[PDB]
Design a protein around this ligand. Sequence first.
Ligand SMILES: Cc1cc2nc3c(=O)[nH]c(=O)nc-3n(C[C@H](O)[C@H](O)[C@H](O)COP(=O)(O)OP(=O)(O)OC[C@H]3O[C@@H](n4cnc5c(N)ncnc54)[C@H](O)[C@@H]3O)c2cc1C
Ligand SMILES: CC(=O)OCC(=O)[C@@]1(O)[C@H](C)C[C@@H]2[C@@H]3CCC4=CC(=O)CC[C@]4(C)[C@@]34O[C@H]4C[C@@]21C
Length: 523
Amino acid sequence: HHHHSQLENLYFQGSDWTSECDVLVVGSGGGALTGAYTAAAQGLTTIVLEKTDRFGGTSAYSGASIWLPGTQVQERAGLPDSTENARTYLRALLGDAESERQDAYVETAPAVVALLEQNPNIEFEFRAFPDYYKAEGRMDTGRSINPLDLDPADIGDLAGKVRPELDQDRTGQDHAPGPMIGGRALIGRLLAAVQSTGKAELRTESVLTSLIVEDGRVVGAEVESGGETQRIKANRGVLMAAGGIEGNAEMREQAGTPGKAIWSMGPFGANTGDAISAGIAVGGATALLDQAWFCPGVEQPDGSAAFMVGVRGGLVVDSAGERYLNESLPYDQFGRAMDAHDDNGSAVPSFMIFDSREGGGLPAICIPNTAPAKHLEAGTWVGADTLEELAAKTGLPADALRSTVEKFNDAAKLGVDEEFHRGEDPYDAFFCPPNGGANAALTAIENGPFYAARIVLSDLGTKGGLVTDVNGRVLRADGSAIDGLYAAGNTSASLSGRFYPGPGVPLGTAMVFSYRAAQDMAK
Ligand SMILES: Cc1cc2nc3c(=O)[nH]c(=O)nc-3n(C[C@H](O)[C@H](O)[C@H](O)COP(=O)(O)OP(=O)(O)OC[C@H]3O[C@@H](n4cnc5c(N)ncnc54)[C@H](O)[C@@H]3O)c2cc1C
Ligand SMILES: CC(=O)OCC(=O)[C@@]1(O)[C@H](C)C[C@@H]2[C@@H]3CCC4=CC(=O)CC[C@]4(C)[C@@]34O[C@H]4C[C@@]21C
Protein backbone atom coordinates (compact mmCIF):
# COMPACT_ATOMS: atom_id res chain seq x y z
CA HIS A 1 0.00 0.00 0.00
CA HIS A 2 0.90 3.64 -0.85
CA HIS A 3 -1.94 6.08 0.09
CA HIS A 4 -2.90 7.52 -3.34
CA SER A 5 -6.39 9.18 -3.48
CA GLN A 6 -9.21 7.64 -5.64
CA LEU A 7 -11.83 9.80 -7.47
CA GLU A 8 -15.28 8.23 -6.93
CA ASN A 9 -16.10 8.45 -10.72
CA LEU A 10 -12.94 6.32 -11.31
CA TYR A 11 -14.02 3.66 -8.74
CA PHE A 12 -17.61 3.98 -10.12
CA GLN A 13 -15.97 2.25 -13.12
CA GLY A 14 -16.62 -1.22 -11.60
CA SER A 15 -17.20 -0.87 -7.81
CA ASP A 16 -19.63 0.68 -5.24
CA TRP A 17 -19.77 1.51 -1.46
CA THR A 18 -19.35 -1.68 0.68
CA SER A 19 -20.50 0.23 3.83
CA GLU A 20 -21.68 3.68 5.06
CA CYS A 21 -21.59 5.86 8.25
CA ASP A 22 -21.94 9.54 9.35
CA VAL A 23 -18.42 9.66 10.97
CA LEU A 24 -15.51 7.40 9.91
CA VAL A 25 -12.65 7.44 12.50
CA VAL A 26 -9.25 5.98 11.43
CA GLY A 27 -7.26 4.80 14.51
CA SER A 28 -8.15 3.79 18.14
CA GLY A 29 -5.90 6.06 20.29
CA GLY A 30 -7.13 8.52 22.94
CA GLY A 31 -8.16 11.08 20.30
CA ALA A 32 -9.68 8.61 17.77
CA LEU A 33 -12.01 7.07 20.43
CA THR A 34 -12.76 10.50 22.02
CA GLY A 35 -13.88 11.78 18.55
CA ALA A 36 -15.77 8.47 17.96
CA TYR A 37 -17.56 8.94 21.35
CA THR A 38 -18.30 12.66 20.68
CA ALA A 39 -19.97 11.67 17.35
CA ALA A 40 -21.85 8.45 18.49
CA ALA A 41 -23.15 9.99 21.79
CA GLN A 42 -25.17 12.67 19.83
CA GLY A 43 -26.66 10.17 17.30
CA LEU A 44 -24.14 10.01 14.35
CA THR A 45 -23.41 6.41 13.11
CA THR A 46 -19.66 5.87 13.69
CA ILE A 47 -17.13 3.28 12.39
CA VAL A 48 -13.66 3.09 14.07
CA LEU A 49 -10.82 1.44 12.06
CA GLU A 50 -7.83 -0.03 13.97
CA LYS A 51 -5.00 -1.26 11.68
CA THR A 52 -3.59 -3.81 14.20
CA ASP A 53 -5.36 -6.58 16.21
CA ARG A 54 -5.43 -4.32 19.36
CA PHE A 55 -7.08 -0.93 20.12
CA GLY A 56 -5.10 1.95 21.74
CA GLY A 57 -1.73 2.12 19.92
CA THR A 58 0.82 4.30 21.85
CA SER A 59 -2.13 5.77 23.84
CA ALA A 60 -2.55 2.29 25.48
CA TYR A 61 1.22 2.16 26.33
CA SER A 62 0.89 5.60 28.02
CA GLY A 63 0.36 6.48 31.70
CA ALA A 64 -2.79 8.34 30.62
CA SER A 65 -1.76 11.61 32.26
CA ILE A 66 -4.00 14.10 30.31
CA TRP A 67 -3.37 17.93 30.10
CA LEU A 68 -7.04 19.14 30.00
CA PRO A 69 -7.02 22.07 32.48
CA GLY A 70 -9.79 24.17 34.14
CA THR A 71 -12.28 21.28 34.26
CA GLN A 72 -14.72 19.84 36.84
CA VAL A 73 -11.95 17.27 37.68
CA GLN A 74 -9.49 19.91 38.90
CA GLU A 75 -12.41 21.73 40.81
CA ARG A 76 -13.20 18.48 42.74
CA ALA A 77 -9.52 18.49 43.95
CA GLY A 78 -9.76 22.27 44.78
CA LEU A 79 -6.75 23.04 42.52
CA PRO A 80 -5.40 26.63 42.46
CA ASP A 81 -5.69 26.65 38.61
CA SER A 82 -8.00 27.98 35.83
CA THR A 83 -8.44 28.01 32.02
CA GLU A 84 -6.78 31.51 32.05
CA ASN A 85 -3.78 30.37 34.23
CA ALA A 86 -3.19 27.46 31.68
CA ARG A 87 -3.53 29.85 28.64
CA THR A 88 -0.71 32.03 30.18
CA TYR A 89 1.67 29.01 30.53
CA LEU A 90 1.15 28.04 26.83
CA ARG A 91 1.58 31.68 25.59
CA ALA A 92 4.72 32.07 27.77
CA LEU A 93 6.23 29.01 26.04
CA LEU A 94 4.90 28.86 22.46
CA GLY A 95 4.28 32.57 21.79
CA ASP A 96 1.54 33.94 19.49
CA ALA A 97 2.32 31.30 16.85
CA GLU A 98 -0.79 29.00 16.74
CA SER A 99 -2.50 31.16 19.41
CA GLU A 100 -5.99 30.30 18.05
CA ARG A 101 -5.39 26.52 18.60
CA GLN A 102 -3.82 27.35 22.00
CA ASP A 103 -7.11 29.22 22.87
CA ALA A 104 -9.30 26.35 21.54
CA TYR A 105 -7.29 23.61 23.42
CA VAL A 106 -7.56 25.30 26.86
CA GLU A 107 -11.16 26.59 26.28
CA THR A 108 -12.62 23.20 25.10
CA ALA A 109 -10.92 21.02 27.84
CA PRO A 110 -13.82 21.47 30.34
CA ALA A 111 -16.58 20.47 27.81
CA VAL A 112 -14.62 17.34 26.63
CA VAL A 113 -14.27 16.21 30.30
CA ALA A 114 -17.93 17.03 31.20
CA LEU A 115 -19.16 14.92 28.19
CA LEU A 116 -16.81 11.94 28.82
CA GLU A 117 -17.44 11.77 32.68
CA GLN A 118 -21.23 11.81 31.91
CA ASN A 119 -20.70 8.24 30.55
CA PRO A 120 -20.85 5.63 33.34
CA ASN A 121 -17.67 3.88 31.94
CA ILE A 122 -15.54 7.12 32.29
CA GLU A 123 -14.23 9.02 35.35
CA PHE A 124 -10.94 11.00 35.77
CA GLU A 125 -8.96 12.37 38.82
CA PHE A 126 -6.16 14.96 39.30
CA ARG A 127 -2.74 13.25 39.90
CA ALA A 128 0.40 15.26 40.83
CA PHE A 129 3.03 15.26 38.02
CA PRO A 130 4.77 18.67 37.63
CA ASP A 131 4.57 20.77 34.41
CA TYR A 132 7.97 20.77 32.65
CA TYR A 133 9.20 24.47 32.20
CA LYS A 134 9.93 27.46 34.52
CA ALA A 135 7.39 30.02 33.16
CA GLU A 136 4.38 32.12 34.40
CA GLY A 137 1.33 29.80 34.91
CA ARG A 138 3.49 26.65 35.59
CA MET A 139 1.90 24.20 38.12
CA ASP A 140 4.72 22.79 40.35
CA THR A 141 2.38 19.89 41.47
CA GLY A 142 0.89 19.80 37.91
CA ARG A 143 -2.75 20.04 36.66
CA SER A 144 -3.09 16.75 34.71
CA ILE A 145 -5.92 14.18 35.15
CA ASN A 146 -5.82 10.36 34.74
CA PRO A 147 -8.57 7.73 34.26
CA LEU A 148 -9.49 5.66 37.35
CA ASP A 149 -8.03 2.10 37.51
CA LEU A 150 -10.54 -0.16 35.66
CA ASP A 151 -11.46 -3.79 36.52
CA PRO A 152 -11.22 -5.55 33.10
CA ALA A 153 -14.40 -7.51 34.07
CA ASP A 154 -16.46 -4.25 33.88
CA ILE A 155 -15.89 -3.99 30.03
CA GLY A 156 -16.41 -7.70 29.06
CA ASP A 157 -15.08 -8.68 25.60
CA LEU A 158 -13.29 -5.26 25.07
CA ALA A 159 -10.52 -5.93 27.72
CA GLY A 160 -8.84 -8.67 25.61
CA LYS A 161 -8.88 -6.23 22.61
CA VAL A 162 -6.89 -3.42 24.42
CA ARG A 163 -3.11 -3.18 23.75
CA PRO A 164 -1.03 -4.27 26.77
CA GLU A 165 1.67 -2.16 28.52
CA LEU A 166 5.20 -2.21 27.00
CA ASP A 167 6.56 -4.58 29.74
CA GLN A 168 4.14 -7.18 28.26
CA ASP A 169 3.68 -6.14 24.57
CA ARG A 170 7.33 -6.36 23.30
CA THR A 171 7.69 -9.88 24.85
CA GLY A 172 4.62 -11.66 23.28
CA GLN A 173 2.60 -11.25 26.53
CA ASP A 174 -0.92 -9.93 27.30
CA HIS A 175 -2.10 -7.78 30.27
CA ALA A 176 -0.74 -9.18 33.59
CA PRO A 177 -2.62 -9.78 36.93
CA GLY A 178 -2.44 -6.02 37.80
CA PRO A 179 -5.73 -4.17 37.00
CA MET A 180 -6.10 -1.93 33.88
CA ILE A 181 -4.16 1.32 34.71
CA GLY A 182 -2.78 4.36 32.79
CA GLY A 183 -3.29 4.02 28.99
CA ARG A 184 -4.95 0.57 29.42
CA ALA A 185 -7.67 2.25 31.60
CA LEU A 186 -8.04 5.20 29.15
CA ILE A 187 -8.68 2.91 26.12
CA GLY A 188 -10.81 0.36 28.06
CA ARG A 189 -13.09 3.15 29.38
CA LEU A 190 -13.27 4.97 25.98
CA LEU A 191 -13.97 1.68 24.04
CA ALA A 192 -16.73 0.93 26.63
CA ALA A 193 -18.17 4.53 26.37
CA VAL A 194 -18.07 4.42 22.48
CA GLN A 195 -19.74 0.93 22.51
CA SER A 196 -22.40 2.09 25.09
CA THR A 197 -23.81 4.67 22.55
CA GLY A 198 -25.26 1.84 20.38
CA LYS A 199 -24.29 4.02 17.33
CA ALA A 200 -20.67 2.89 16.76
CA GLU A 201 -18.87 -0.06 15.13
CA LEU A 202 -15.36 -0.88 16.51
CA ARG A 203 -13.14 -2.85 14.01
CA THR A 204 -9.62 -4.36 14.33
CA GLU A 205 -7.30 -5.40 11.43
CA SER A 206 -9.12 -2.70 9.35
CA VAL A 207 -6.38 -0.58 7.64
CA LEU A 208 -6.90 2.83 5.94
CA THR A 209 -5.44 2.66 2.40
CA SER A 210 -6.75 5.74 0.49
CA LEU A 211 -9.19 8.62 1.01
CA ILE A 212 -11.97 8.78 -1.64
CA VAL A 213 -12.60 12.28 -3.15
CA GLU A 214 -15.65 13.49 -5.19
CA ASP A 215 -15.52 17.11 -6.54
CA GLY A 216 -12.64 17.84 -4.06
CA ARG A 217 -14.60 16.79 -0.89
CA VAL A 218 -13.66 13.60 1.10
CA VAL A 219 -16.73 11.28 1.00
CA GLY A 220 -15.19 8.04 2.38
CA ALA A 221 -12.08 5.80 2.41
CA GLU A 222 -10.65 2.60 0.87
CA VAL A 223 -10.02 0.10 3.75
CA GLU A 224 -8.28 -3.38 3.78
CA SER A 225 -9.74 -6.01 6.20
CA GLY A 226 -9.52 -9.85 5.88
CA GLY A 227 -7.61 -10.02 2.53
CA GLU A 228 -10.37 -8.18 0.58
CA THR A 229 -10.92 -4.38 0.05
CA GLN A 230 -13.91 -2.34 1.45
CA ARG A 231 -15.12 1.19 0.37
CA ILE A 232 -16.63 2.99 3.43
CA LYS A 233 -18.87 6.04 2.81
CA ALA A 234 -18.59 8.91 5.41
CA ASN A 235 -21.64 11.28 5.17
CA ARG A 236 -20.23 14.01 7.55
CA GLY A 237 -16.46 13.26 7.49
CA VAL A 238 -13.33 11.17 8.15
CA LEU A 239 -11.33 11.81 11.38
CA MET A 240 -7.68 10.71 11.01
CA ALA A 241 -6.11 10.02 14.46
CA ALA A 242 -3.87 7.12 13.31
CA GLY A 243 -0.72 8.65 14.85
CA GLY A 244 2.40 9.99 13.14
CA ILE A 245 5.49 8.86 11.14
CA GLU A 246 7.24 7.39 14.28
CA GLY A 247 7.49 3.84 12.74
CA ASN A 248 8.46 4.96 9.16
CA ALA A 249 12.32 5.26 8.88
CA GLU A 250 12.06 6.54 5.24
CA MET A 251 9.53 9.34 6.01
CA ARG A 252 11.79 10.32 9.02
CA GLU A 253 15.06 10.37 6.92
CA GLN A 254 13.11 12.46 4.38
CA ALA A 255 11.78 15.00 6.98
CA GLY A 256 15.12 15.09 8.89
CA THR A 257 13.38 13.84 12.07
CA PRO A 258 16.12 13.00 14.61
CA GLY A 259 16.06 9.57 16.35
CA LYS A 260 15.25 6.31 14.52
CA ALA A 261 12.07 4.25 13.87
CA ILE A 262 13.73 1.32 15.76
CA TRP A 263 14.15 3.64 18.83
CA SER A 264 10.48 4.94 18.83
CA MET A 265 8.27 3.54 21.66
CA GLY A 266 5.28 3.53 19.20
CA PRO A 267 4.00 -0.08 18.70
CA PHE A 268 6.31 -1.80 16.14
CA GLY A 269 4.68 -1.57 12.65
CA ALA A 270 1.58 0.53 13.67
CA ASN A 271 2.22 4.29 13.11
CA THR A 272 3.84 4.47 9.62
CA GLY A 273 2.30 7.78 8.45
CA ASP A 274 -0.62 6.01 6.66
CA ALA A 275 -3.06 8.94 7.46
CA ILE A 276 -0.50 11.80 6.92
CA SER A 277 0.33 10.25 3.50
CA ALA A 278 -3.43 9.84 2.68
CA GLY A 279 -3.98 13.53 3.69
CA ILE A 280 -1.12 14.84 1.47
CA ALA A 281 -2.57 12.77 -1.47
CA VAL A 282 -5.84 14.82 -1.34
CA GLY A 283 -3.90 18.17 -1.01
CA GLY A 284 -3.13 18.58 2.73
CA ALA A 285 -0.25 20.86 3.86
CA THR A 286 2.26 19.48 6.43
CA ALA A 287 4.43 21.14 9.13
CA LEU A 288 7.00 20.29 11.84
CA LEU A 289 7.74 16.75 10.42
CA ASP A 290 11.35 16.96 11.82
CA GLN A 291 9.78 17.36 15.34
CA ALA A 292 8.89 14.57 17.81
CA TRP A 293 7.94 14.01 21.44
CA PHE A 294 11.60 13.12 22.27
CA CYS A 295 12.90 11.04 25.22
CA PRO A 296 16.18 9.40 26.24
CA GLY A 297 15.99 5.64 25.53
CA VAL A 298 18.07 2.85 27.15
CA GLU A 299 19.47 0.97 24.10
CA GLN A 300 18.33 -2.74 24.15
CA PRO A 301 20.14 -5.91 22.94
CA ASP A 302 17.67 -6.15 19.98
CA GLY A 303 18.72 -2.58 18.92
CA SER A 304 15.37 -0.95 20.03
CA ALA A 305 15.01 1.41 23.07
CA ALA A 306 13.22 1.73 26.46
CA PHE A 307 11.72 5.04 27.70
CA MET A 308 14.05 6.43 30.45
CA VAL A 309 11.87 8.60 32.76
CA GLY A 310 12.14 9.70 36.46
CA VAL A 311 15.97 9.68 36.71
CA ARG A 312 17.08 9.48 40.39
CA GLY A 313 20.85 8.75 40.21
CA GLY A 314 24.00 8.47 38.06
CA LEU A 315 25.12 11.07 35.51
CA VAL A 316 25.41 11.09 31.68
CA VAL A 317 28.57 11.73 29.56
CA ASP A 318 29.22 12.31 25.81
CA SER A 319 31.92 10.27 23.97
CA ALA A 320 34.39 12.66 25.70
CA GLY A 321 33.31 11.34 29.15
CA GLU A 322 31.95 14.74 30.31
CA ARG A 323 28.43 15.77 31.49
CA TYR A 324 26.67 18.04 28.91
CA LEU A 325 23.14 18.32 30.44
CA ASN A 326 20.97 18.06 33.58
CA GLU A 327 20.26 14.26 33.68
CA SER A 328 17.05 15.08 35.68
CA LEU A 329 15.67 17.31 32.83
CA PRO A 330 12.18 16.39 31.54
CA TYR A 331 12.55 13.73 28.83
CA ASP A 332 11.72 15.97 25.77
CA GLN A 333 14.34 18.59 26.83
CA PHE A 334 16.84 15.83 27.77
CA GLY A 335 16.44 14.42 24.21
CA ARG A 336 16.55 17.82 22.37
CA ALA A 337 19.83 18.54 24.32
CA MET A 338 21.37 15.17 23.20
CA ASP A 339 20.47 16.21 19.61
CA ALA A 340 21.93 19.75 19.93
CA HIS A 341 25.22 18.46 21.46
CA ASP A 342 25.79 15.72 18.78
CA ASP A 343 28.95 16.25 16.66
CA ASN A 344 28.53 13.17 14.45
CA GLY A 345 28.09 10.71 17.36
CA SER A 346 29.50 12.50 20.43
CA ALA A 347 26.10 12.47 22.25
CA VAL A 348 23.97 9.79 20.38
CA PRO A 349 24.76 7.50 22.01
CA SER A 350 25.46 9.09 25.43
CA PHE A 351 26.61 6.93 28.43
CA MET A 352 24.67 6.76 31.75
CA ILE A 353 27.26 6.13 34.53
CA PHE A 354 25.89 4.54 37.77
CA ASP A 355 27.07 2.31 40.68
CA SER A 356 25.66 -0.60 42.78
CA ARG A 357 23.43 1.77 44.83
CA GLU A 358 20.36 -0.02 43.27
CA GLY A 359 21.99 -3.51 43.36
CA GLY A 360 23.06 -3.29 39.66
CA GLY A 361 19.81 -1.51 38.60
CA LEU A 362 19.91 1.63 36.40
CA PRO A 363 18.71 4.47 38.70
CA ALA A 364 15.57 5.37 36.63
CA ILE A 365 12.22 3.96 35.32
CA CYS A 366 12.97 2.10 32.05
CA ILE A 367 9.81 1.18 30.03
CA PRO A 368 10.09 -1.62 29.26
CA ASN A 369 12.62 -2.74 31.94
CA THR A 370 15.16 -5.34 30.66
CA ALA A 371 17.17 -7.30 33.30
CA PRO A 372 20.76 -5.92 33.76
CA ALA A 373 22.15 -9.45 33.04
CA LYS A 374 20.62 -9.30 29.51
CA HIS A 375 22.16 -5.85 28.84
CA LEU A 376 25.64 -6.95 30.11
CA GLU A 377 25.56 -10.22 28.03
CA ALA A 378 24.71 -8.09 24.94
CA GLY A 379 27.18 -5.18 25.67
CA THR A 380 24.52 -2.35 25.70
CA TRP A 381 25.64 -1.96 29.33
CA VAL A 382 29.23 -2.51 30.61
CA GLY A 383 30.43 -3.18 34.22
CA ALA A 384 33.77 -2.83 36.05
CA ASP A 385 35.20 -2.73 39.60
CA THR A 386 36.92 0.66 38.71
CA LEU A 387 36.17 3.75 36.56
CA GLU A 388 39.59 3.23 34.78
CA GLU A 389 38.48 -0.25 33.57
CA LEU A 390 34.89 0.95 32.89
CA ALA A 391 36.39 3.66 30.58
CA ALA A 392 38.55 0.92 28.90
CA LYS A 393 35.51 -1.35 28.24
CA THR A 394 33.37 1.62 26.94
CA GLY A 395 35.99 3.48 24.80
CA LEU A 396 35.61 6.58 27.03
CA PRO A 397 38.61 8.81 27.83
CA ALA A 398 39.66 7.44 31.30
CA ASP A 399 41.24 10.69 32.63
CA ALA A 400 38.04 12.65 31.65
CA LEU A 401 35.43 10.13 33.02
CA ARG A 402 37.33 9.94 36.39
CA SER A 403 37.45 13.85 36.55
CA THR A 404 33.73 14.08 35.56
CA VAL A 405 32.83 11.59 38.37
CA GLU A 406 35.10 13.12 41.15
CA LYS A 407 33.55 16.60 40.24
CA PHE A 408 29.91 15.27 40.27
CA ASN A 409 30.57 13.45 43.59
CA ASP A 410 31.88 16.75 45.03
CA ALA A 411 28.62 18.51 44.06
CA ALA A 412 26.60 15.68 45.62
CA LYS A 413 28.32 16.19 49.01
CA LEU A 414 27.98 19.99 48.61
CA GLY A 415 24.33 19.93 47.49
CA VAL A 416 24.44 21.98 44.26
CA ASP A 417 25.40 21.09 40.68
CA GLU A 418 27.32 24.26 39.66
CA GLU A 419 27.57 23.12 36.00
CA PHE A 420 23.95 22.08 35.26
CA HIS A 421 21.83 23.02 38.36
CA ARG A 422 20.50 19.44 38.73
CA GLY A 423 17.83 18.93 41.42
CA GLU A 424 16.99 22.67 41.52
CA ASP A 425 13.52 22.26 39.91
CA PRO A 426 10.15 20.78 41.07
CA TYR A 427 10.29 18.17 38.25
CA ASP A 428 13.87 17.05 39.08
CA ALA A 429 12.97 16.68 42.80
CA PHE A 430 9.63 14.95 42.05
CA PHE A 431 11.22 11.53 41.39
CA CYS A 432 14.02 11.79 43.96
CA PRO A 433 13.30 10.18 47.38
CA PRO A 434 15.32 12.05 50.08
CA ASN A 435 18.78 10.57 50.75
CA GLY A 436 21.27 11.60 53.47
CA GLY A 437 22.48 14.61 51.43
CA ALA A 438 21.57 18.27 50.87
CA ASN A 439 20.21 17.50 47.37
CA ALA A 440 18.15 14.34 46.67
CA ALA A 441 18.85 14.50 42.91
CA LEU A 442 22.64 14.39 43.44
CA THR A 443 23.88 11.04 44.83
CA ALA A 444 27.62 10.20 44.76
CA ILE A 445 28.60 7.31 42.41
CA GLU A 446 31.56 5.76 44.33
CA ASN A 447 29.93 2.36 45.15
CA GLY A 448 31.45 -0.50 43.08
CA PRO A 449 30.98 -1.99 40.62
CA PHE A 450 30.22 0.87 38.16
CA TYR A 451 28.14 0.47 34.99
CA ALA A 452 27.84 2.35 31.68
CA ALA A 453 24.52 2.16 29.79
CA ARG A 454 24.15 3.32 26.17
CA ILE A 455 21.35 5.97 25.88
CA VAL A 456 19.97 6.79 22.33
CA LEU A 457 17.44 9.44 21.14
CA SER A 458 14.09 7.62 21.54
CA ASP A 459 10.57 9.13 21.06
CA LEU A 460 6.93 8.78 22.24
CA GLY A 461 5.75 9.36 18.63
CA THR A 462 6.33 12.25 16.16
CA LYS A 463 4.32 15.55 16.43
CA GLY A 464 4.68 16.71 12.80
CA GLY A 465 1.89 16.07 10.26
CA LEU A 466 -1.13 17.71 8.52
CA VAL A 467 -1.94 21.43 9.11
CA THR A 468 -5.38 21.79 10.82
CA ASP A 469 -7.64 24.67 12.05
CA VAL A 470 -9.27 25.01 15.52
CA ASN A 471 -11.86 22.34 14.48
CA GLY A 472 -9.27 19.78 13.23
CA ARG A 473 -10.10 20.53 9.53
CA VAL A 474 -7.10 19.54 7.29
CA LEU A 475 -5.90 22.62 5.29
CA ARG A 476 -4.19 22.99 1.89
CA ALA A 477 -1.03 25.16 1.60
CA ASP A 478 -3.35 28.12 0.67
CA GLY A 479 -5.17 27.87 4.09
CA SER A 480 -8.44 26.53 2.59
CA ALA A 481 -10.10 23.52 4.25
CA ILE A 482 -10.52 20.10 2.56
CA ASP A 483 -14.23 19.38 3.21
CA GLY A 484 -14.82 15.98 4.89
CA LEU A 485 -11.32 15.51 6.30
CA TYR A 486 -10.30 16.12 9.95
CA ALA A 487 -7.07 15.08 11.73
CA ALA A 488 -5.95 14.95 15.40
CA GLY A 489 -3.29 13.34 17.60
CA ASN A 490 0.11 12.84 15.93
CA THR A 491 -1.52 12.79 12.43
CA SER A 492 -1.89 16.58 13.07
CA ALA A 493 1.12 18.92 13.49
CA SER A 494 1.19 19.96 17.21
CA LEU A 495 0.27 23.53 18.26
CA SER A 496 3.17 22.88 20.77
CA GLY A 497 5.97 23.33 18.14
CA ARG A 498 9.40 22.36 19.64
CA PHE A 499 7.88 22.31 23.24
CA TYR A 500 6.49 19.49 25.51
CA PRO A 501 4.74 21.87 27.96
CA GLY A 502 3.79 19.23 30.57
CA PRO A 503 2.38 15.74 31.16
CA GLY A 504 -0.65 14.73 29.03
CA VAL A 505 -0.31 17.37 26.24
CA PRO A 506 -0.20 14.69 23.49
CA LEU A 507 -3.44 12.92 24.72
CA GLY A 508 -4.90 16.36 25.70
CA THR A 509 -4.53 18.04 22.26
CA ALA A 510 -5.57 14.73 20.61
CA MET A 511 -8.78 14.50 22.75
CA VAL A 512 -9.81 18.21 22.36
CA PHE A 513 -9.29 18.36 18.53
CA SER A 514 -10.82 14.85 17.98
CA TYR A 515 -13.88 16.15 19.98
CA ARG A 516 -13.94 19.49 18.09
CA ALA A 517 -13.77 17.67 14.70
CA ALA A 518 -16.87 15.56 15.72
CA GLN A 519 -18.68 18.80 16.85
CA ASP A 520 -17.94 20.34 13.39
CA MET A 521 -19.24 17.16 11.63
CA ALA A 522 -22.42 17.37 13.82
CA LYS A 523 -22.86 20.85 12.12
C1 LIG B 1 5.46 4.73 27.95
C2 LIG B 1 4.77 5.95 27.38
C3 LIG B 1 4.12 6.81 28.23
C4 LIG B 1 3.43 7.93 27.75
N1 LIG B 1 2.70 8.65 28.65
C5 LIG B 1 1.98 9.62 28.18
C6 LIG B 1 1.14 10.31 29.06
O1 LIG B 1 0.97 9.95 30.22
N2 LIG B 1 0.35 11.31 28.56
C7 LIG B 1 0.41 11.68 27.27
O2 LIG B 1 -0.33 12.59 26.91
N3 LIG B 1 1.25 11.08 26.40
C8 LIG B 1 1.98 10.08 26.82
N4 LIG B 1 2.80 9.39 25.95
C9 LIG B 1 2.77 9.75 24.51
C10 LIG B 1 1.46 9.31 23.83
O3 LIG B 1 1.26 7.91 24.09
C11 LIG B 1 1.37 9.52 22.31
O4 LIG B 1 2.01 10.71 21.86
C12 LIG B 1 -0.10 9.59 21.87
O5 LIG B 1 -0.82 8.48 22.40
C13 LIG B 1 -0.24 9.58 20.37
O6 LIG B 1 -1.61 9.28 20.05
P1 LIG B 1 -2.02 9.13 18.53
O7 LIG B 1 -3.50 9.09 18.32
O8 LIG B 1 -1.23 10.19 17.82
O9 LIG B 1 -1.42 7.65 18.33
P2 LIG B 1 -1.87 6.21 18.87
O10 LIG B 1 -2.38 6.29 20.27
O11 LIG B 1 -0.73 5.25 18.71
O12 LIG B 1 -3.06 5.80 17.88
C14 LIG B 1 -2.72 5.37 16.53
C15 LIG B 1 -3.47 4.11 16.16
O13 LIG B 1 -3.78 4.19 14.75
C16 LIG B 1 -3.55 2.93 14.15
N5 LIG B 1 -3.30 3.10 12.70
C17 LIG B 1 -2.14 3.49 12.08
N6 LIG B 1 -2.25 3.54 10.78
C18 LIG B 1 -3.55 3.13 10.53
C19 LIG B 1 -4.28 2.96 9.34
N7 LIG B 1 -3.77 3.18 8.12
N8 LIG B 1 -5.56 2.53 9.45
C20 LIG B 1 -6.06 2.30 10.67
N9 LIG B 1 -5.47 2.43 11.85
C21 LIG B 1 -4.21 2.85 11.71
C22 LIG B 1 -2.38 2.35 14.93
O14 LIG B 1 -2.33 0.95 14.78
C23 LIG B 1 -2.72 2.79 16.36
O15 LIG B 1 -3.51 1.76 16.94
C24 LIG B 1 3.48 8.25 26.37
C25 LIG B 1 4.23 7.42 25.53
C26 LIG B 1 4.82 6.26 26.00
C27 LIG B 1 5.58 5.38 25.06
C1 LIG C 1 2.47 2.62 36.77
C2 LIG C 1 2.58 2.74 38.25
O1 LIG C 1 2.11 1.99 39.05
O2 LIG C 1 3.28 3.81 38.61
C3 LIG C 1 4.40 4.13 37.78
C4 LIG C 1 4.18 5.45 37.06
O3 LIG C 1 4.11 6.48 37.68
C5 LIG C 1 4.07 5.38 35.54
O4 LIG C 1 4.82 4.24 35.10
C6 LIG C 1 2.60 5.30 34.99
C7 LIG C 1 2.32 4.22 33.95
C8 LIG C 1 2.28 6.73 34.47
C9 LIG C 1 3.45 7.58 34.95
C10 LIG C 1 3.62 8.99 34.40
C11 LIG C 1 2.26 9.65 34.19
C12 LIG C 1 2.41 11.05 33.60
C13 LIG C 1 3.09 10.99 32.27
C14 LIG C 1 2.54 11.56 31.18
C15 LIG C 1 3.16 11.57 29.87
O5 LIG C 1 2.60 12.06 28.90
C16 LIG C 1 4.51 10.94 29.76
C17 LIG C 1 4.69 9.83 30.77
C18 LIG C 1 4.42 10.27 32.22
C19 LIG C 1 5.51 11.27 32.64
C20 LIG C 1 4.53 9.05 33.16
O6 LIG C 1 5.91 8.81 33.51
C21 LIG C 1 5.21 7.83 32.71
C22 LIG C 1 5.01 6.49 33.36
C23 LIG C 1 4.66 6.65 34.84
C24 LIG C 1 5.88 7.14 35.64
